[PDB]
Amino acid sequence: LMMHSQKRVVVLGSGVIGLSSALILARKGYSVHILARDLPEDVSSQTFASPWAGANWTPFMTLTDGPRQAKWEESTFKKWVELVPTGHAMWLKGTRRFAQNEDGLLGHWYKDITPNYRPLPSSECPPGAIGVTYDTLSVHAPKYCQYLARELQKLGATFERRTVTSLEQAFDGADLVVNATGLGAKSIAGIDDQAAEPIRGQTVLVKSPCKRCTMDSSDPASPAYIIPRPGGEVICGGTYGVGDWDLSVNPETVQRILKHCLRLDPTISSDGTIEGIEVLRHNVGLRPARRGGPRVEAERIVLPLDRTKSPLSLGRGSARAAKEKEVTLVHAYGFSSAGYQQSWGAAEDVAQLVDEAFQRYHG
Amino acid sequence: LMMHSQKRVVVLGSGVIGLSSALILARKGYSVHILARDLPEDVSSQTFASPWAGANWTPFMTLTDGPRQAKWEESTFKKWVELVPTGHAMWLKGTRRFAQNEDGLLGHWYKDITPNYRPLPSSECPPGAIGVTYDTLSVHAPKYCQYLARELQKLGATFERRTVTSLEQAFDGADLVVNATGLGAKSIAGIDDQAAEPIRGQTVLVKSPCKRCTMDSSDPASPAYIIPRPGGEVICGGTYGVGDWDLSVNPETVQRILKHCLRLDPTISSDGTIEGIEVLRHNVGLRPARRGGPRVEAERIVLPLDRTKSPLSLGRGSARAAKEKEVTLVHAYGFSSAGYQQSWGAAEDVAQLVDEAFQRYHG
Ligand SMILES: Cc1cc2nc3c(=O)[nH]c(=O)nc-3n(C[C@H](O)[C@H](O)[C@H](O)COP(=O)(O)OP(=O)(O)OC[C@H]3O[C@@H](n4cnc5c(N)ncnc54)[C@H](O)[C@@H]3O)c2cc1C
Ligand SMILES: Cc1cc2nc3c(=O)[nH]c(=O)nc-3n(C[C@H](O)[C@H](O)[C@H](O)COP(=O)(O)OP(=O)(O)OC[C@H]3O[C@@H](n4cnc5c(N)ncnc54)[C@H](O)[C@@H]3O)c2cc1C
Ligand SMILES: Nc1ccccc1C(=O)O
Ligand SMILES: Nc1ccccc1C(=O)O
Ligand SMILES: Nc1ccccc1C(=O)O
Ligand SMILES: Nc1ccccc1C(=O)O
Numbered sequence: 001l002m003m004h005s006q007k008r009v010v011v012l013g014s015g016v017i018g019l020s021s022a023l024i025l026a027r028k029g030y031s032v033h034i035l036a037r038d039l040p041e042d043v044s045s046q047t048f049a050s051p052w053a054g055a056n057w058t059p060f061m062t063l064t065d066g067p068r069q070a071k072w073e074e075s076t077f078k079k080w081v082e083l084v085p086t087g088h089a090m091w092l093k094g095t096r097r098f099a100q101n102e103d104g105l106l107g108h109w110y111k112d113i114t115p116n117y118r119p120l121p122s123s124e125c126p127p128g129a130i131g132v133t134y135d136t137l138s139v140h141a142p143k144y145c146q147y148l149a150r151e152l153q154k155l156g157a158t159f160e161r162r163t164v165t166s167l168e169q170a171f172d173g174a175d176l177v178v179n180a181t182g183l184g185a186k187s188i189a190g191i192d193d194q195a196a197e198p199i200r201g202q203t204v205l206v207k208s209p210c211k212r213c214t215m216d217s218s219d220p221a222s223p224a225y226i227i228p229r230p231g232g233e234v235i236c237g238g239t240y241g242v243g244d245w246d247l248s249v250n251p252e253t254v255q256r257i258l259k260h261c262l263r264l265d266p267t268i269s270s271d272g273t274i275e276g277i278e279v280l281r282h283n284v285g286l287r288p289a290r291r292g293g294p295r296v297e298a299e300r301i302v303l304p305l306d307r308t309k310s311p312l313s314l315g316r317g318s319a320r321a322a323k324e325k326e327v328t329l330v331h332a333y334g335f336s337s338a339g340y341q342q343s344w345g346a347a348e349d350v351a352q353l354v355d356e357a358f359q360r361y362h363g
Numbered sequence: 364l365m366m367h368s369q370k371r372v373v374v375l376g377s378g379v380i381g382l383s384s385a386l387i388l389a390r391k392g393y394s395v396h397i398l399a400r401d402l403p404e405d406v407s408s409q410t411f412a413s414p415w416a417g418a419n420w421t422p423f424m425t426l427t428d429g430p431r432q433a434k435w436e437e438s439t440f441k442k443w444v445e446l447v448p449t450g451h452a453m454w455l456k457g458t459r460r461f462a463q464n465e466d467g468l469l470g471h472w473y474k475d476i477t478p479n480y481r482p483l484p485s486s487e488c489p490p491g492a493i494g495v496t497y498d499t500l501s502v503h504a505p506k507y508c509q510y511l512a513r514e515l516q517k518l519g520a521t522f523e524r525r526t527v528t529s530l531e532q533a534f535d536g537a538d539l540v541v542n543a544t545g546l547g548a549k550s551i552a553g554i555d556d557q558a559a560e561p562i563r564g565q566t567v568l569v570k571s572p573c574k575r576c577t578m579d580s581s582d583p584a585s586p587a588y589i590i591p592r593p594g595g596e597v598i599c600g601g602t603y604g605v606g607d608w609d610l611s612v613n614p615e616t617v618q619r620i621l622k623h624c625l626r627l628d629p630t631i632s633s634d635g636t637i638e639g640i641e642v643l644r645h646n647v648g649l650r651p652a653r654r655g656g657p658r659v660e661a662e663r664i665v666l667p668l669d670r671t672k673s674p675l676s677l678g679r680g681s682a683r684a685a686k687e688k689e690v691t692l693v694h695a696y697g698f699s700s701a702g703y704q705q706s707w708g709a710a711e712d713v714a715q716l717v718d719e720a721f722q723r724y725h726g
Contacts, residue, residue, distance in 0.1 A: 044526050047410060047610075163407050165644060187612040187645070196611070245608035247410075248559070249550040251674040275670070275680030281528060282550070282675050307638070311614040312645050317638030 005031045006363055009354060012170045013180030014039050014159065015050035015288075016141075016340050017332050019148040020347035021178050026155035028351055034152070035170060037163040037184070040145040046247050049182055052201065052285025053141035054227035054235055055340035056092060056213060063109045068296070069338065070109060072345030077113050079344040080137040088139060088147050090230055095136045096120060098129040098216040105132060126263075129218030136213065139340060140229045164188055166314050167329070168303050175362050176328040178350060182288030185295075185333050189312040190305050193295070198286035199336060200241035202253050204261075206268055207278040208234045214264045224260035226268060233280065234268055236261040240337075242289075249282045290334025296346055298330045298353040300361075328357040368394045369726055372717060375533045376543030377402050377522065378413035378651075379504075379703050380695050382511040383710035384541050389518035391714055397515070398533060400526040400547070403508040409610050412545055415564065415648025416504035417590035417598055418703035419455060419576060426472045431659070432701065433472060435708030440476050442707040443500040451502060451510050453593055458499045459483060461492040461579040468495060489626075492581030499576065502703060503592045527551055529677050530692070531666050538725050539691040541713060545651030548658075548696050552675040553668050556658070561649035562699060563604035565616050567624075569631055570641040571597045577627045587623035589631060596643065597631055599624040603700075605652075612645045653697025659709055661693045661716040663724075691720040 007030045011022040014036035026032045038048040045051060057077055061069050083089035093116075099105050111117035111134070120131035149159070164170050167190030170177045179185060186196040209232050215225045227235045238257040239250075258274050266272030301309075303326070306319035313319070330353045335342055370393045374385040377399035389395045401411040408414060420440055424432050446452035456479075462468050474480035474497070483494035512522070527533050530553030533540045542548060549559040572595050578588045590598045601620040602613075621637050629635030664672075666689070669682035676682070693716045698705055 183611065187647075192614065194614070245610060247608060248546065249675060251555065251557070254674060270679055273680070278679050279677050281677070284550075311617060312612060314642050314644070316633055316641050317636070 007031055007358065008174040009176045009178060010035055010170055010172055010174040011178040011180060012036065012164060013182065013184070013333070015048050015180060015182055016145055016148070016343045017335060017346060018178065018180030019145055019152070020343045021180055021332055021350040022157055023148055023151055023155070024347045024351045025354060026152060026157050028355070030354070032152070032157040033172070033174070034157060034159045035162045035164065035172065036159070037161065039159060039161060040142070040149040043142040046284060046286070049285050049288050049339065050145055051142045052203070052283055053340050054138060054229070055141040055144070056138040056227050057136045057341040058097070058215060059106060059110050060338060062106050068294070069342060072342035072349070073110070073338070074113055075345030075348060076341055076343055077137060080139065083139070084137070087230065088144060090138050091135055092138050092213040092228060093135040094133055095213040096124070096131055096133045096215070098125055098131040098218045100218045100220070101130060104217055105130065108132070126216060126218055129216065138213070138227060138229055140231070141340065144340070166190055166312070167301065167305060171303060171327050175325075176330065176354060176357060178330045178332060178354070180332045182333055183286065187312070189310040189314065190301065192310050192312060193290070195291040196334060197243050197289050197291060198245055199289045200239055200244035200246060201237060201285050201287055202239045202250060202257070203235050203237040203283045204254060204257055204279060205281040205283060206234045206236055207232060207280050208268045210234050210265060210268045212265060216260070216264055219260070222256055222260050224257065224264055226261055226265055236268065245286060247284050249284060254282060287336050288334060288339070289336035294334045294336070294342070294346070295331045296349050298328055298357050300326060301329050302326050328361060330354055330357065370394055370721065371537040372539045372541060373398055373533055373535055373537040374541040374543060375399065375527060376545065376547070376696070378411050378543060378545055379508055379511070379706045380698060380709060381541065381543030382508055382515070383706045384543055384695055384713040385520055386511055386514055386518070387710045387714045388717060389515060389520050391718070393717070395515070395520040396535070396537070397520060397522045398525045398527065398535065399522070400524065402522060402524060403505070403512040406505040409647060409649070412648050412651050412702065413508055414505045415566070415646055416703050417501060417592070418504040418507070419501040419590050420499045420704040421460070421578060422469060422473050423701060425469050431657070432705060435705035435712070436473070436701070437476055438708030438711060439704055439706055440500060443502065446502070447500070450593065451507060453501050454498055455501050455576040455591060456498040457496055458576040459487070459494055459496045459578070461488055461494040461581045463581045463583070464493060467580055468493065471495070489579060489581055492579065501576070501590060501592055503594070504703065507703070529553055529675070530664065530668060534666060534690050538688075539693065539717060539720060541693045541695060541717070543695045545696055546649065550675070552673040552677065553664065555673050555675060556653070558654040559697060560606050560652050560654060561608055562652045563602055563607035563609060564600060564648050564650055565602045565613060565620070566598050566600040566646045567617060567620055567642060568644040568646060569597045569599055570595060570643050571631045573597050573628060573631045575628060579623070579627055582623070585619055585623050587620065587627055589624055589628055599631065608649060610647050612647060617645060650699050651697060651702070652699035657697045657699070657705070657709070658694045659712050661691055661720050663689060664692050665689050691724060693717055693720065
């Protein structure tokens with residue numbers, strides 16, 4: 001006769017978003033089980049996005065275009081600040097950001113957040129480009145995820161490898177599921193979101209003591225970035241292929257990325273030559289984006305699913321009673337290129353929805 | 364002081380092709396270690412093709428266009444015949460195959476192989492289509508692979524999960540590697556084959572005691588097939604998206620596949636209605652194809668790799684001595700839609716190359 005918890009939650013997805021949601025829910029006292037295909041130990045898996053990020057904090061919208069985005073970014077920055085002392089985050093001082101025009105600098109909304117924010121002289125920008133410098137924060141994407149996972153372990157969360165094809169499979173002994181499935185949200189019956197889209201990112205992992213972060217959007221026909229991370233490693237990138245699922249390495253893209261990046265900062269080379277760059281790995285990830293922006297909202301759903309709820313529902317088109325429970329589905333996906341830098345704020349919004357839902361339905 | 368084998372081989376890839384190559388090499392006495400990202404237990408992994416096949420024997424070329432293909436298919440048929448008694452293969456009697464024209468029937472080259480081969484009357488074909496019927500063989504694709512894996516275990520082969528980015532990582536204590544990597548052949552340094560391309564296949568797994576196989580290519584704008592497999596399951600398919608990497612389920616494609624398939628044989632429905640079809644799973648696999656056809660050939664390679672051998676070579680563009688061994692790389696990939704049905708013959712050609720190479724180089 002043991003007192004048992006009535007605060008059970010399934011988190012579907014183990015990328016940085018499910019992990020951070022899970023961690024805040026667990027700290028709040030929820031009993032959390034994580035169900036996912038891809039787990040933090042799968043550091044070279046291409047079927048989720050989280051191993052492949054920089055990951056730094058680089059705002060991409062105006063306050064007006066991305067009010068939630070900015071709120072989430074601002075909150076995650078404070079958290080990363082708190083992680084510098086133990087090394088789970090790293091200052092990228094004197095980051096330089098180059099854009100085509102004043103528009104590309106997004107109203108400078110974040111200037112009070114990133115220290116030493118200031119405009120660059122045109123002597124310190126590529127030709128025709130405008131620029132600012134500031135100090136921002138970075139995490140080692142796969143290690144940061146494993147760190148979150150350890151924190152979850154200690155709070156008693158559990159992990160289970162599973163690939164779900166229909167919602168009832170996730171409502172596994174719980175009446176609330178957190179859906180943090182990235183691109184998978186499109187092909188799971190009960191979610192079916194056609195708006196989910198990938199945005200392909202190829203990068204080159206480079207061995208280099210280069211400690212400066214440079215980003216250049218001033219050339220539409222060649223996005224370039226250098227993002228340092230702990231371990232004497234930098235990530236050189238350059239692609240944004242919207243709707244592109246190709247997982248294979250483009251050899252021509254290798255050269256365009258390294259040339260542009262070299263341009264940006266020859267010290268990523270052993271001798272300022274393309275040929276002096278010490279390549280560790282060629283990488284391709286697909287950012288899990290969504291037309292209409294990230295989806296963070298709670299929905300009420302009746303189970304089991306019928307073919308009129310989902311084109312992908314299992315069994316025969318004809319469905320009826322055979323019970324019929326109602327559960328809560330809290331969406332958290334389609335963060336595109338900003339999942340790490342928005343992750344802690346997003347998880348905060350997620351846990352507020354869960355608190356909310358439990359107050360209303362589940363007791 | 365123990366006598367040790369000098370017949371070591373690494374098989375890179377654990378799809379039906381690496382598995383079958385591995386099995387014949389092991390039966391020949393080779394010591395075989397399999398290195399691969401995706402293993403036979405990963406039955407819902409979309410990063411290799413082998414879990415997703417029918418898999419039946421359906422020749423797709425003329426003798427003139429695909430001489431090796433036909434040789435390999437003919438050989439695999441005899442092997443599958445030998446597997447019927449233990450259930451690792453299943454007769455699909457009275458298979459029906461519909462094409463647009465006489466051309467689509469490929470010269471009837473295989474008529475002595477599939478029993479009871481004969482033309483269909485136009486009364487038994489869709490409108491405007493021509494057809495033959497014959498008895499062919501099918502295997503349960505993921506279970507067949509696990510079966511091969513058990514046979515490998517008993518012959519002492521071992522398996523290890525690994526994702527390779529450069530050839531020297533595969534030449535792990537062996538001087539011969541079998542490269543059976545499907546699409547991965549394009550992005551591994553030392554192979555770099557730009558000709559590798561995926562061909563997307565969406566299907567619907569259906570619960571049904573339907574035991575007949577029907578295939579209809581008479582409609583270019585909608586390929587359709589019904590392929591029974593052990594367990595009261597049939598696979599209904601329809602896509603061939605060349606160069607398409609999209610791993611998400613197309614809901615519109617679901618309906619087009621089920622309607623066409625229903626057309627072909629209403630008994631896949633519980634009541635001959637789309638709504639009576641008992642859906643088990645929606646699937647998407649990418650067939651590992653190659654412009655210029657499958658590659659089965661042995662190549663001699665010097666290690667370590669330099670950036671002039673591979674655009675993707677690791678380290679700095681500048682490379683030299685630091686040793687320099689020479690090894691054998693036996694290619695076996697780009698089987699597209701015919702990897703299972705060509706698999707045993709392909710593996711036979713593979714093991715002959717290995718025998719050859721060992722006679723020449725490795726002793
Ligand atoms: C090259 C590159 C550069 C980037 N750099 C940065 C950067 O500097 N800063 C920044 O903030 N972000 C960056 N991003 C985007 C960041 O990678 C993504 O926004 C973030 O990883 C997405 O997190 P997620 O948890 O939403 O999704 P995905 O990581 O990481 O997780 C989807 C989770 O859902 C599971 N899934 C869905 N399908 C199913 C199902 N059917 N069954 C079971 N589980 C399933 C998956 O297995 C995985 O567990 C980068 C990405 C890329 C490719
Ligand atoms: C819908 C559908 C229908 C089909 N039906 C049939 C049919 O009826 N009959 C027929 O014959 N065939 C069919 N096919 C094609 C058959 O599926 C493929 O031809 C066959 O699976 C390919 O076998 P493979 O071993 O070449 O490649 P892939 O299965 O199965 O294996 C690639 C192996 O290489 C490993 N790999 C490569 N990248 C790397 C690396 N970098 N490091 C480590 N390992 C790595 C992978 O992880 C995997 O182990 C079907 C396919 C599809 C999608
Ligand atoms: N928004 C981005 C984020 C990262 C890399 C590129 C882009 C881009 O628009 O091209
Ligand atoms: N999210 C980013 C932040 C900075 C540079 C690149 C990226 C990227 O997604 O590619
Ligand atoms: N050659 C094929 C094999 C299987 C399915 C479709 C095709 C096709 O040409 O459309
Ligand atoms: N290889 C096949 C044989 C028969 C029907 C379909 C396929 C297919 O690849 O889709």
